Structure formats: structure tokens, C-alpha cells
């Protein structure tokens, strides 16, 4: 199982403002994970695109476990994300009948052409 830091969709310490720009005009199910703005209520923030808006979701790490809410039963952020690529988030919140479909990859680099 791969580490969080090498995961294409993990962008570490970028701002909420930078994520806005990355998710501008993207399709539903587009997502990426970054570090939480602050420190005392969740380690990471998953941001996904739904209905032309951005939905921010705290990821908690306690006692060697990860998840969106108690009980935390995932072994890593990678395992949690991978689980919801194929499974809807609806079981947590009615507004999130959507899967994690399209990662914003830090490896996917487009080249502007110079003549």
C-alpha cells in the first residue's frame, strides 16, 4: 500500500484558495486532498466537486486509525480514498451521493508551448 506523500491526489500544504482554482469548472467527482487549514480538528481536508461547488470533508487520524467519523476503521488515508472511488459517500450525508472519480494529480503536468 502506497504512502500518502506519494499519492497523486495528495497536495500537502496548499491553501483553500489554491484548491478553489484547481477545482474551477471541473466535473462532479473531481477531488484532491490537502492538509487541514488548522490543526485541532482533523489532519486532512478532502475537497470534492459536486453540483458546481466544492465540498470540504475533514479526515481524522486517532489511535492509529483514519476516517470521516467515529468509529475510525481505515488503516491509511490512501485506503480510505481508494474505498470511495467505487462506493458513494451518501451513507455519511444525503448531499454526497457521489464517488471519488477524478483525482487532481500533482504528476499530471501540461506544457504551454513557446514559439
Amino acid at each position: 500500500n502506497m504512502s500518502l506523500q506519494n499519492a497523486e491526489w495528495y497536495w500537502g500544504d496548499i491553501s483553500r484558495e489554491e484548491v478553489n482554482e484547481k477545482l474551477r469548472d471541473t466535473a462532479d467527482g473531481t477531488f484532491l486532498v490537502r492538509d487541514a487549514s488548522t490543526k485541532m480538528h482533523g489532519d486532512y481536508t478532502l475537497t470534492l466537486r459536486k453540483g458546481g461547488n466544492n465540498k470540504l470533508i475533514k479526515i481524522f487520524h486517532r489511535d492509529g486509525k483514519y476516517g470521516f467519523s467515529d468509529p475510525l476503521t481505515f488503516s491509511s488515508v490512501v485506503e480510505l480514498i481508494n474505498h470511495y472511488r467505487n462506493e458513494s459517500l451518501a451513507q455519511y450525508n444525503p448531499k454526497l451521493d457521489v464517488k471519488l472519480l477524478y483525482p487532481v494529480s500533482k504528476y499530471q503536468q501540461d506544457q504551454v508551448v513557446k514559439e
Binding site: R16, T47, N53, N54, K55, L56, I57, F68, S69, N93
Partner: peptide
């Protein structure tokens, strides 16, 4: 807009 989701 950005919206923080209640997951509980």
C-alpha cells in the same frame, strides 16, 4: 462556493 460537510 466551499462548504464544510457534516459527516456524522
Amino acid at each position: 462556493t466551499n462548504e464544510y460537510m457534516d459527516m456524522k
